[PDB]
Amino acid sequence: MPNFFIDRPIFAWVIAIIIMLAGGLAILKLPVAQYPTIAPPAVTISASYPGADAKTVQDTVTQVIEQNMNGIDNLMYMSSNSDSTGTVQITLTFESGTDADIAQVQVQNKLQLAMPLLPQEVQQQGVSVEKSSSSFLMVVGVINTDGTMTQEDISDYVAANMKDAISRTSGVGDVQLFGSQYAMRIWMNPNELNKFQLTPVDVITAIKAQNAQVAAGQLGGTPPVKGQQLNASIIAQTRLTSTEEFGKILLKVNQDGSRVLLRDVAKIELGGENYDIIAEFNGQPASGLGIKLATGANALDTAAAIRAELAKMEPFFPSGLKIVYPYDTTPFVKISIHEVVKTLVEAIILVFLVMYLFLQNFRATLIPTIAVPVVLLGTFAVLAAFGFSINTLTMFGMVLAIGLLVDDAIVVVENVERVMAEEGLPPKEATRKSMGQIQGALVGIAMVLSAVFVPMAFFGGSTGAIYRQFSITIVSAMALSVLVALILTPALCATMLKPIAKGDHGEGKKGFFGWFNRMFEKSTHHYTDSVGGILRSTGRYLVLYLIIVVGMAYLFVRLPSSFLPDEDQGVFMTMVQLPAGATQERTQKVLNEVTHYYLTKEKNNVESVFAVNGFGFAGRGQNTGIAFVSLKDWADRPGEENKVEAITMRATRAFSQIKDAMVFAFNLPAIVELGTATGFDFELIDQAGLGHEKLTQARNQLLAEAAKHPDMLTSVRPNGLEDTPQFKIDIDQEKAQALGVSINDINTTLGAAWGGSYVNDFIDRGRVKKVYVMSEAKYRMLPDDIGDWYVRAADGQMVPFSAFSSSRWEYGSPRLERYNGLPSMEILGQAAPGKSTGEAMELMEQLASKLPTGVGYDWTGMSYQERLSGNQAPSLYAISLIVVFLCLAALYESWSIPFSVMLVVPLGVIGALLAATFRGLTNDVYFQVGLLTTIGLSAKNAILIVEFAKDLMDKEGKGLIEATLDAVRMRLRPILMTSLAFILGVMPLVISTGAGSGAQNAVGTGVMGGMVTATVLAIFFVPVFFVVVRRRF
Amino acid sequence: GADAKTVQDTVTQVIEQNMNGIDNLMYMSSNSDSTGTVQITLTFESGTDADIAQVQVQNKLQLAMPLLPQEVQQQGVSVEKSSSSFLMVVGVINTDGTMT
Amino acid sequence: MLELLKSLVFAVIMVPVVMAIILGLIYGLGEVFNIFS
């Protein structure tokens, strides 16, 4: 087949042409995202039930929904959390790969039937049903710098004058608003109501009454009279467009007709639906747009289009109005591109150098430079053909696939120079023989590696998706290379190489190259001089081979594991917790203390503070909040101190000093879905429906033994929340309707007065919007304000609450969970340093085992997955062991020699470890995919050596050693070529700091060093392996 | 019984919003009329899967139902793969006139 | 594009070194095995 093209070089070019086009056709159509999808499909339902408590939300809504989720498919597990914001979030967990839409539609439709069973206010508010994405292209912060508006004020211009336009930009799928539109905020004063003997109900029904759609009919509509000729549409009462109108919403009228108005006993202005969360950007009111990268869109493209949209609204911005982008992914991605090609193009040059340093002439040093791009170009077309996207994962694997690409050609063009330099043969005929010798070699190898690299694509869950981005990248680009090696380069080796005389290594050259070749050829001798020595006595080199191998596990197991390196991203979050029920205002001060701190101490590196009050990760309400901070670009942040994690603890150490709060700042997991490799998610489940308290007791009880095994566990904590003093009140039914006082008015006034109540819709500026009714805060603050509110007795007299009502403080849990529809309590912890999770997990199970009757548990999330994808690891290695031996034995027709190859494995791996531990690293896939390209190349150099050595015994007939030496020598240079080229190309990735550096450096170190030992060690020991296997057999 | 404009802000634009970011979305055209009724016809890439299309639409649409005035909800909101050109028309009469 | 002139030098300057590295390895290491032979 190689000879097919030798006689048809153009027919090689022709293919080499198509590849550049298709590849080129891919570079334009190949998508862009910092990361692809990893997380398994999960649906999340969002329902709100205003002014409420966790158990109401649970009791009335959740469990109802829990029931009807039945019938849906591919469910992994069902999570629920209920809270004292009158909110639910039910996230449904679906098997990886499960169609998320079907997953969606099914859910939402299971919901429709269950919607009726829900409360109306639930229904009138609506519920939101989502696929789970916490990813965002960027956070659009928006601000007004003259202080002339609120964030609610600003909130609306966002939704109304901004939000939709960007929703209509190209490449954005999702537009969130981090603030609420105006709503009509009615604020009711009892003391005015009673004066008029009135209720919110009086207000309510009135609001409903006179703000609504009254549909009419037609004049002249059908059927008409014959003789008709004037038919139109009739227009009659409609919703109100303005507050002042609402004031004229008319509570009541008299027989004389005097008007009691809505504003005659309650203030009115537009407002935020929820005053829950406050925003501050660098100290002033704010909101924000969560923007998410649409599926397959070009991450670098959308963020710009966004910037463009917002550029043209600028004339239309009020004074002080401005935008900010406290968060964006695009910045980190663009560089990630430019860093990869800089790795490829500069490596093509080194090769041009290396081939030059050796061949020292221009023509051959061109050919791989032809050969290397084509596959690269070609690879993108394989990727984009079945449609991977350029991403962080996929770029590192390409560069890691260099090492196999670089050497494929060099090996190829190498063997032709040797034949020429040794046999002086014309390159074209010279080319064939090179191919004649090594053709079977390439075949076996490309079988081997594909046996090494394909295994990992069958990995499960989130992590496997990580592994098959590299794997499918590393399997294709390696395949195309072999086609090239077998096709173009030979016709490039036949045509584009010039003849050289028989017997010339170039010693007779002048200058640095004669000095060179003389040195190298001399460096060749001593090496084999000892190798032959190495071979006279094998037993020693077998003993010492065991030694190296032992330290491998010793250094291998001593090395901890992780998912992903943590990068300075320019941004980091800091998280606050106050005591329980601790108020909002208090919450907001430390923030300003938080915010000010950055701008105070971190002024250099910190550009901005984007603040959130009342919203936690660990649950919501006043006593929590987060400061999302931004920094200046790395180039503005010299040294590690200026870098986040450095910034982090510094910031952290200072916030330790705080009073009243749990303040800690931390980095952002490059993927916020991945959790922790040493940590675990767990559920304390009540199988028996014991209720709550008991369920708790086991929990804390479960921490007791837990905290009695830090030796295994650490950080073992419940994620959820604690019972607070919460205010009971008792209705005395009998006293009530003894006054002739109906219950709902009591209940309804109540939930509406104190809780606040959404009545109905109006429109503003042509925008349909909500109405609310509620008591002025100062009115609704406190229990003594309860009795301030009165009720209209059926007889007309106004009835206070302190009359029929009797109350107490009490404890209740202002958040609640059910897991797969069983009340759950989360726990969170990690394995002790030096301890793996499953050991921890096993112990929870034991400690979970010993819990009270009715107490179950479930592991979940990264624990649920860490359970299933652990079983899979060894069964693949064996498959990955089996396939590998078979193929060589095919190439070799030997049930032993293949072992002579297999022993090279620890030689590259060992050096690889050294560098990760000397730099004190951890075990990750940038490392564990790098552990692979290394091993192969080490089995690349031994197979070939044994190819010739074998070739020397079966063809030239030469005995075992004299061939063994013979092979190692001839292959000396190319190994030296190989290792020489590969090592310097990855050099930048070793020193690389800055954005994306931890990842870059990750691949770099484990690969570089192991390629120090593989290069150097293997070439010594692999001839022994061969000899020790061959002699033994 | 209402008017287009209201209908447009009560529903139509309530609808236009959740419709950002569904796949193969070539263009949208909507209408609201003095009969109180809407049509919103979506068109997606030639070769698109209309069911799948039907699904993402169905998915986003759910977002806006709570944003609907009730009778619209009670009246119900259907999403249907549409063709504005009837295949045919079959007509009918009574030829003895015995019917109207 | 001082970008390439930036990498061009170092990419060249290291070539003899790393080759100088390993020739010294085989120098020092080739001394190991004769010595350990």
Residue A75's CATH number: 3.30.70.1430
Breaks (C-N over 2.5 A) in chain C follow: none
CA–CA dist A902, A895 (Å, integer): 12
CA distances from A405 to A193, A344, A802, A847, A982 (A): 83, 11, 84, 52, 10
The shortest CB-CB distance from A101 to any of B6, B21, B56 is to: B56
Q: Pairing between strand A724-731 and A805-812? A: antiparallel
Largest CA distance in chain A: 126
CA distances from A269 to A153, A287, A753, A771, A773 (A): 11, 20, 16, 10, 11
The shortest CB-CB distance from B3 to any of A105, A108, A235 is to: A235
Q: What angle do CA A935, A938, A942 make, to 5 degrees?
A: 140
Show the tokens assigned to A1011. 């390629």
Burial degree of A708 (CB within 10 A; 0-12, 13-18, 19+) = exposed
CA–CA dist A843, A859 (Å, integer): 12
DSSP E strands, A916-971: none
Chosen from A208, A231, A233, A758 to mutate, greatest number of chain B CBs within 10 A: A233
What's the gap between Cα A219 and its chain centre? 61
Is the same domain home to A574 and A562?
Answer: no
Q: How many domains does chain A have?
A: 8
Contact B6 A124 (CB under 8 A): no
Task: Give the chain A residue whose CA is nearest to the CA of B76.
Answer: A112
Is the same domain home to A421 and A340?
Answer: yes
Domain end residue (candidates: A510, A528, A555)? A510
Is the same domain home to A160 and A299?
Answer: yes
Chosen from A48, A102, A108 to mutate, greatest number of chain B CBs within 10 A: A108
Contact B14 A768 (CB under 8 A): yes
> Which residues of C are less than 8 Å from A346 in CB distance?
4, 7, 11
What's the half-sphere exposure (Cβ side, CA atoms, 13 Å) at A978? 26
Would you give the DSSP letter of residue A816?
Answer: E
Is the same domain home to A991 and A931?
Answer: yes
Q: Pairing between strand A767-775 and A790-792? A: unpaired
Phi, psi of A993 (to 5 degrees): -115, -175
CA distances from A644 to A571, A617, A635, A638 (A): 8, 21, 13, 11
Is the same domain home to A699 and A663?
Answer: no
Domain end residue (candidates: A812, A832, A849)? A812
CA distances from A730 to A455, A750, A790, A810 (A): 66, 12, 16, 12
A534: nearest Cα among A958, A1009, A1017, A900: A1017
What's the gap between Cα B67 and its chain centre? 16
- Cβ contacts of A515 within 8 Å, gap of 6 or more: none
Is the same domain home to A852 and A914?
Answer: no
Within 10 angstroms of residue A962's Cβ, the number of other Cβ atoms is: 13
Chosen from A112, A768, A769 to mutate, greatest number of chain B CBs within 10 A: A768
Contact B20 A126 (CB under 8 A): no
Residue environment code for A495-510, b if the CB has 16+ CB neighbours within 10 A, otherwise e:
bbbeebeeeebbbeee
Phi, psi of A4 (to 5 degrees): -60, -50
Chosen from B5, B7, B9, B34 to mutate, greatest number of chain A CBs within 10 A: B9
Give A 935-994 residues with CB within 8 A of chain C: 976, 979-980, 983-984, 987-988
Handedness of CA A591, A594, A598, A599 (dihedral sign): positive
Is the same domain home to A412 and A496?
Answer: yes
Q: Resolution for this model in angstroms, one decimal place?
A: 5.9
Contact A984 C18 (CB under 8 A): yes
What's the half-sphere exposure (Cβ side, CA atoms, 13 Å) at A351? 31
Contact C22 A1016 (CB under 8 A): yes
Contact C30 A346 (CB under 8 A): no
CA–CA dist A447, A880 (Å, integer): 12
Burial degree of A94 (CB within 10 A; 0-12, 13-18, 19+) = buried
H/E run at residue A47: strand A42-48
Phi, psi of A67 (to 5 degrees): -55, -50
Instruction: Map residue A228 onto helix, strand or coil.
Output: coil
Is there a cis peptide before residue A223, judged by omega within 30 degrees of 0? yes
Residue type, A903: L
Contact C11 A353 (CB under 8 A): yes
Show the tokens assigned to A500. 């050289």
Task: Give the chain A residue whose CA is nearest to the CA of B53.
Answer: A101
Is the same domain home to A388 and A463?
Answer: yes
A1009: nearest Cα among A925, A938, A924: A938
A74: nearest Cα among A92, A56, A87, A58: A92
CA distance C37 to chain A (A): 7
User: CB–CB of B21/A167 below 8 Å?
Assistant: yes
Is the same domain home to A981 and A919?
Answer: yes
Give A 81-110 residues with CB within 8 A of chain C: none
CATH number at residue A283: 3.30.70.1320
> Which residues of C are less than 8 Å from A529 in CB distance?
30, 34
H/E run at residue A454: none
Phi, psi of A267 (to 5 degrees): -65, 160
Q: Domain span at residue A84? A: 38-132+813-820
CA distance A1028 to chain C (A): 17
Q: Does A519 touch chain C (CB under 8 A)?
A: yes
Is the same domain home to A324 and A245?
Answer: no
The shortest CB-CB distance from B66 to any of A105, A126, A172 is to: A126
Beta bridge partners of A757: A773
CA–CA dist A475, A489 (Å, integer): 20
> Which residues of A are less than 8 Å from B36 in CB distance?
215
CA distance A633 to chain C (A): 20
Within 10 angstroms of residue A320's Cβ, the number of other Cβ atoms is: 14
Residues comprising chain B, all counted:
100
> Which residues of B are less than 8 Å from A175 in CB distance?
20-21
CA–CA dist A967, A415 (Å, integer): 12
Chains near B with 3+ CB pairs less than 8 A apart are A
Phi, psi of A941 (to 5 degrees): -80, -25
Task: Give the chain A residue whose CA is nearest to the CA of C34.
Answer: A530
CA distance B72 to chain A (A): 12
Contact B9 A767 (CB under 8 A): yes
Q: What angle do CA B45, B48, B53 make, to 5 degrees?
A: 105
User: CB–CB of A83/A57 below 8 Å?
Assistant: yes
Is the same domain home to A193 and A223?
Answer: yes
Task: Give the chain A residue whose CA is nearest to the CA of B13.
Answer: A767
Show the tokens assigned to A304. 């710009």
Residue environment code for A541-550, b if the CB has 16+ CB neighbours within 10 A, otherwise e:
beeebeebbe
CA–CA dist A117, A910 (Å, integer): 64
CA–CA dist A267, A246 (Å, integer): 11
Phi, psi of A485 (to 5 degrees): -50, -35
Contact C23 A519 (CB under 8 A): yes
Show the tokens assigned to A221. 């509509």
CATH number at residue A257: 3.30.2090.10
CA–CA dist A815, A802 (Å, integer): 29
CA distance B97 to chain A (A): 22
Contact B66 A127 (CB under 8 A): yes
Phi, psi of A138 (to 5 degrees): -160, 155
Task: Give the chain C residue whose CA is nearest to the CA of A1015.
Answer: C22
CA–CA dist A9, A487 (Å, integer): 9
CATH number at residue A395: 1.20.1640.10
Is the same domain home to A965 and A993?
Answer: yes
The shortest CB-CB distance from C19 to any of A526, A527, A980 is to: A980
User: CB–CB of A992/A1008 below 8 Å?
Assistant: no
> Which residues of A are less than 8 Å from B65 in CB distance?
126
Contact A530 C33 (CB under 8 A): yes
